[PDB]
Amino acid sequence: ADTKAKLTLDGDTAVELDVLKGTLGQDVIDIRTLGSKGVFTFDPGFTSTTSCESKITFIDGDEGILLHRGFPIDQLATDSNYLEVCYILLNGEKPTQEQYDEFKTTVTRHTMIHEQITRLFHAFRRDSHPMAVMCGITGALAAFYHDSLDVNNPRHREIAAFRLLSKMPTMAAMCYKYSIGQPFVYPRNDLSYAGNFLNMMFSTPCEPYEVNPILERAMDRILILHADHEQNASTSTVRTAGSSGANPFACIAAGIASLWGPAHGGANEAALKMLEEIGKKENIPEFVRRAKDKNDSFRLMGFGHRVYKNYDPRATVMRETCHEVLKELGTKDDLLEVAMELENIALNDPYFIEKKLYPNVDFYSGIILKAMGIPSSMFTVIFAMARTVGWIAHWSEMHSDGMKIARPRQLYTGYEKRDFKSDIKR
Amino acid sequence: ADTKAKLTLDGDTAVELDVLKGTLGQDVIDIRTLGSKGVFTFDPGFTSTTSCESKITFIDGDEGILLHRGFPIDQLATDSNYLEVCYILLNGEKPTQEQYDEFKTTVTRHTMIHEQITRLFHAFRRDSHPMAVMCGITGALAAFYHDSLDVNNPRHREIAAFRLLSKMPTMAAMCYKYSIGQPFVYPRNDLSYAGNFLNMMFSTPCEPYEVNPILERAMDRILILHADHEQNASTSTVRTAGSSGANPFACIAAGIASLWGPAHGGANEAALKMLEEIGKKENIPEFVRRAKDKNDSFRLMGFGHRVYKNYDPRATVMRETCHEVLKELGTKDDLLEVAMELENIALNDPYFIEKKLYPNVDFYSGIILKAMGIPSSMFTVIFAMARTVGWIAHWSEMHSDGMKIARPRQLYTGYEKRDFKSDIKR
Amino acid sequence: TRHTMIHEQITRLFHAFRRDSHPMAVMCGITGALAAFYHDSLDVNNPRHREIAAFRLLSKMPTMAAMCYKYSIGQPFVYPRNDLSYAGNFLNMMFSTPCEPYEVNP
Numbered sequence: 001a002d003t004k005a006k007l008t009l010d011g012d013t014a015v016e017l018d019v020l021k022g023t024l025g026q027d028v029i030d031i032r033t034l035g036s037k038g039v040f041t042f043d044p045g046f047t048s049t050t051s052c053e054s055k056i057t058f059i060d061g062d063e064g065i066l067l068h069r070g071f072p073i074d075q076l077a078t079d080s081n082y083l084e085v086c087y088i089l090l091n092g093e094k095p096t097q098e099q100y101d102e103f104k105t106t107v108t109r110h111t112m113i114h115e116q117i118t119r120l121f122h123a124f125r126r127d128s129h130p131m132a133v134m135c136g137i138t139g140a141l142a143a144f145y146h147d148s149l150d151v152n153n154p155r156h157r158e159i160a161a162f163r164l165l166s167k168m169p170t171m172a173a174m175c176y177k178y179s180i181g182q183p184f185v186y187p188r189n190d191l192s193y194a195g196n197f198l199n200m201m202f203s204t205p206c207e208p209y210e211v212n213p214i215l216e217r218a219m220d221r222i223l224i225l226h227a228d229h230e231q232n233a234s235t236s237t238v239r240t241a242g243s244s245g246a247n248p249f250a251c252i253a254a255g256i257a258s259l260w261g262p263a264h265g266g267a268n269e270a271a272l273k274m275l276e277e278i279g280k281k282e283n284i285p286e287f288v289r290r291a292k293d294k295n296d297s298f299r300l301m302g303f304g305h306r307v308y309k310n311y312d313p314r315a316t317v318m319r320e321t322c323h324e325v326l327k328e329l330g331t332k333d334d335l336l337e338v339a340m341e342l343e344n345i346a347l348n349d350p351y352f353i354e355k356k357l358y359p360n361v362d363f364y365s366g367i368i369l370k371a372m373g374i375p376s377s378m379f380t381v382i383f384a385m386a387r388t389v390g391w392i393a394h395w396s397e398m399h400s401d402g403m404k405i406a407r408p409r410q411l412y413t414g415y416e417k418r419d420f421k422s423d424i425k426r
Numbered sequence: 427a428d429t430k431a432k433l434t435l436d437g438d439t440a441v442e443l444d445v446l447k448g449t450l451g452q453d454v455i456d457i458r459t460l461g462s463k464g465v466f467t468f469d470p471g472f473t474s475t476t477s478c479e480s481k482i483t484f485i486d487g488d489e490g491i492l493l494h495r496g497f498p499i500d501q502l503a504t505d506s507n508y509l510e511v512c513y514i515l516l517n518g519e520k521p522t523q524e525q526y527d528e529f530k531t532t533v534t535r536h537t538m539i540h541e542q543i544t545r546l547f548h549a550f551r552r553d554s555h556p557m558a559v560m561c562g563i564t565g566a567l568a569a570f571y572h573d574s575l576d577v578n579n580p581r582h583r584e585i586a587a588f589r590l591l592s593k594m595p596t597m598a599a600m601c602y603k604y605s606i607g608q609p610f611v612y613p614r615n616d617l618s619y620a621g622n623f624l625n626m627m628f629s630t631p632c633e634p635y636e637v638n639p640i641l642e643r644a645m646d647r648i649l650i651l652h653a654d655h656e657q658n659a660s661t662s663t664v665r666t667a668g669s670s671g672a673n674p675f676a677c678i679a680a681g682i683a684s685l686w687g688p689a690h691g692g693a694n695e696a697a698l699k700m701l702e703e704i705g706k707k708e709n710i711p712e713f714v715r716r717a718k719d720k721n722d723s724f725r726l727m728g729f730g731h732r733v734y735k736n737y738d739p740r741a742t743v744m745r746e747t748c749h750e751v752l753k754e755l756g757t758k759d760d761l762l763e764v765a766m767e768l769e770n771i772a773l774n775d776p777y778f779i780e781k782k783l784y785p786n787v788d789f790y791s792g793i794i795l796k797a798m799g800i801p802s803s804m805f806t807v808i809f810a811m812a813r814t815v816g817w818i819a820h821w822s823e824m825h826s827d828g829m830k831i832a833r834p835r836q837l838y839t840g841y842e843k844r845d846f847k848s849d850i851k852r
Numbered sequence: 853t854r855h856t857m858i859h860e861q862i863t864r865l866f867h868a869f870r871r872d873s874h875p876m877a878v879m880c881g882i883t884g885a886l887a888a889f890y891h892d893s894l895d896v897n898n899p900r901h902r903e904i905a906a907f908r909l910l911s912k913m914p915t916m917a918a919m920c921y922k923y924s925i926g927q928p929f930v931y932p933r934n935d936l937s938y939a940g941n942f943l944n945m946m947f948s949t950p951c952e953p954y955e956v957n958p
């Protein structure tokens with residue numbers, strides 16, 4: 001907290017700049033004045049620049065720490081439930097009973113989506129990727145919910161939020177049902193947030209569906225563990241679109257697409273096939289399928305991580321949840337020996353050891369969801385669905401900030417003024 | 427390098443930073459590696475941070491300078507046409523008759539929209555705002571044209587950029603038609619870009635439509651004048667979404683929603699309400715909307731601009747064209763000479779001279795559109811339609827810089843780790 | 853109670869109206885189209901005809917009115933239930949959603 005006093009800069013003149021500090025994490029040099037002075041930095045990507053102050057989530061990557069409103073991710077995972085984590089993320093404090101009661105009633109109150117929005121799904125191809133259908137529908141909500149689009153009105157945000165929060169799962173489960181040809185399942189108030197999702201995902205009218213408390217709690221954990229992850233590509237996208245005035249539904253729609261981005265990204269995308277396909281306990285085990293690794297696309301298959309140095313703090317609760325489920329679903333797991341085998345190769349192969357392609361939270365989330373009969377295409381959908389509450393919090397915090405439409409500068413390197421004379425006559 | 431030779435970051439040991447210079451504009455300070463030394467700047471609002479290096483468009487706010495690949499907007503809007511200008515923004519140089527004819531040929535052959543998408547149009551409510559439908563449709567494109575979503579594959583990127591350039595006019599016209607209940611019109615390979623769009627907007631099976639030459643030119647100029655505007659908010663959203671690897675259509679959709687953004691509030695349309703809701707001199711102004719304007723109610727009608735200091739270089743030719751259109755139509759303008767009084771007010775009213783609320787390009791653009799018989803609920807759809815080529819160029823550039831991953835950092839000021847104790851239930 | 857349901861095709865008619873239309877105009881529209889679906893009871897000179905036409909209008913008007921409302925607010929249609937009263941059934945068709953069994957206050 002010492003040098004936090006101040007510091008200066010100067011190329012042709014003297015400028016005194018303060019050194020701000022956070023409640024956690026390193027200091028920052030407030031350059032909020034250099035602009036006027038006539039001084040501008042150059043940071044493509046905002047790697048050495050801090051774009052905001054936040055009180056939502058704290059991450060210390062080198063130390064594998066993740067906090068949501070101060071609360072460690074591990075405790076919330078085992079001790080809380082998704083809805084309560086939502087409240088905490090959006091409000092900043094654990095909810096009293098009465099507070100959580102109302103929060104849950106409001107949410108349960110608007111889970112249904114306008115029948116006309118439901119008509120939109122039928123205009124997509126049955127062969128479309130459920131993630132693309134997810135972005136499509138979310139990006140159309142504004143044409144149906146035009147009464148809560150003014151982001152300058154607080155009540156507006158309040159409403160828009162509950163709408164996205166209550167309806168995202170109804171929407172995600174519809175994408176799945178449309179992709180496999182089964183009828184849509186309405187939201188039920190008698191079920192939990194997780195139970196209800198499983199219900200809407202798997203029940204048919206041919207027999208009452210019964211949710212296994214084990215798989216349910218497992219889903220609840222998959223959700224809490226993806227609720228929010230500090231600043232990153234998709235959240236920065238939601239923050240930028242937001243401060244540009246864009247309505248809340250459009251902001252979340254862009255967030256979902258940013259989150260999907262790495263996936264239909266190419267080299268990534270093709271290695272996705274290699275995993276979901278090759279696996280005959282001859283390839284994966286004898287490092288055959290892994291004998292091919294030109295394209296890394298590791299974190300995509302659940303290996304390694306960009307922020308956390310040695311391990312993903314969220315992976316602890318999930319691995320134990322994964323163990324549990326795999327046993328609850330009894331002996332119907334033969335091919336899923338590659339699960340045990342890949343983890344082994346991830347922790348015991350010098351390469352992975354050296355390059356640190358350690359199993360992150362998604363490795364186990366993926367194993368859990370698969371064991372449940374959920375197709376891969378629905379993986380990002382469920383993560384985006386869960387991440388929506390975090391996007392709302394960040395978006396709600398970007399507004400409440402100072403509504404300062406961010407306008408970065410550019411270092412113009414192009415052509416100096418030149419006269420124009422077309423070479424065409426058509 | 428004027429008032430900036432070299433600079434030294436002072437904390438406890440002088441840290442010299444290299445100053446960079448553009449071909450035009452201000453010089454900047456390099457700070458890319460600072461973070462790699464635990465030193466980060468703080469700057470919410472991006473008042474001093476230069477997010478990128480670009481060669482597309484140059485603006486000099488105080489001088490009212492706007493260039494596209496070095497050419498003065500005035501010159502392009504007068505001696506060129508939209509397509510030639512798209513080629514320039516996209517390719518960096520003016521085309522040869524051969525390059526132009528090749529480019530033009532590729533554009534016209536991708537103008538038709540997939541029939542399945544037409545079904546999606548009919549699922550939206552008939553009273554849907556044209557811009558909302560436009561957002562709804564664009565964000566849904568990735569689900570169909572799924573063969574061009576690999577943002578790192580140069581073949582996919584050109585194919586996507588061309589699809590957008592070809593289809594936007596098509597989708598924009600259909601948004602209009604649908605809102606008024608007239609049948610959709612197909613592109614006309616023999617018509618020019620602007621003439622084709624006017625035909626898709628106003629033709630009907632009842633009889634043949636005649637594209638007025640003066641109106642054809644007025645529209646092309648409006649397009650030209652909205653082709654691109656450097657690093658603004660909507661462009662920032664596009665670039666930021668694109669950094670995460672989001673597909674081309676998702677980014678453009680984000681740009682559209684971003685452009686619509688600052689127009690959702692109540693006082694937003696409440697203001698841009700009487701601007702047209704009344705057509706008679708002594709009524710809208712005459713001791714009326716003098717103070718009857720409440721939050722923005724100025725900047726939304728085409729008065730003032732945070733980029734330019736004295737005037738808008740785009741308004742120049744746009745004002746010239748305005749005359750030609752009113753002149754030409756005669757019986758489709760004259761009633762509408764409430765503009766001259768609005769303009770006069772802004773030129774002499776102490777309140778306007780005060781706020782520098784000078785008539786911008788959108789003041790004159792709106793007059794032309796209101797004269798061609800275009801509803802105010804299509805103005806921003808048209809602006810966005812024209813701006814797409816610019817959004818596309820910027821998206822590409824960012825991808826030329828190697829998909830500049832825009833992931834800023836934060837200054838955390840929330841709770842320090844604290845134990846989670848839940849005594850409630852569900 | 854025997855004929856409160858309306859032919860599924862007549863039900864398709866509602867979807868051709870705007871969601872923003874006045875429910876009274878949708879009510880006149882649908883009622884004025886019933887003849888294209890119930891062409892067997894149109895001869896007003898036949899007594900049995902009147903008998904039938906009557907029971908049809910009588911049993912189906914509430915099913916129709918509640919559909920107008922549901923279409924106007926974007927909720928799914930609710931079928932007629934034989935276990936309820938004429939009034940109870942109407943309230944049911946007007947307010948119940950599939951998200952929870954609806955209970956009519958006596």
Ligand SMILES: O=C([O-])CC(=O)C(=O)O
Nearest residue numbers: 229230231232233306307
């Ligand atoms: O890199 C990040 O912070 C994003 C992340 O892991 C996630 O979205 O699960």
Ligand SMILES: O=C([O-])CC(=O)C(=O)O
Nearest residue numbers: 655657658659660732733
């Ligand atoms: O305010 C800005 O710089 C953006 C702008 O005018 C435009 O998009 O035409």
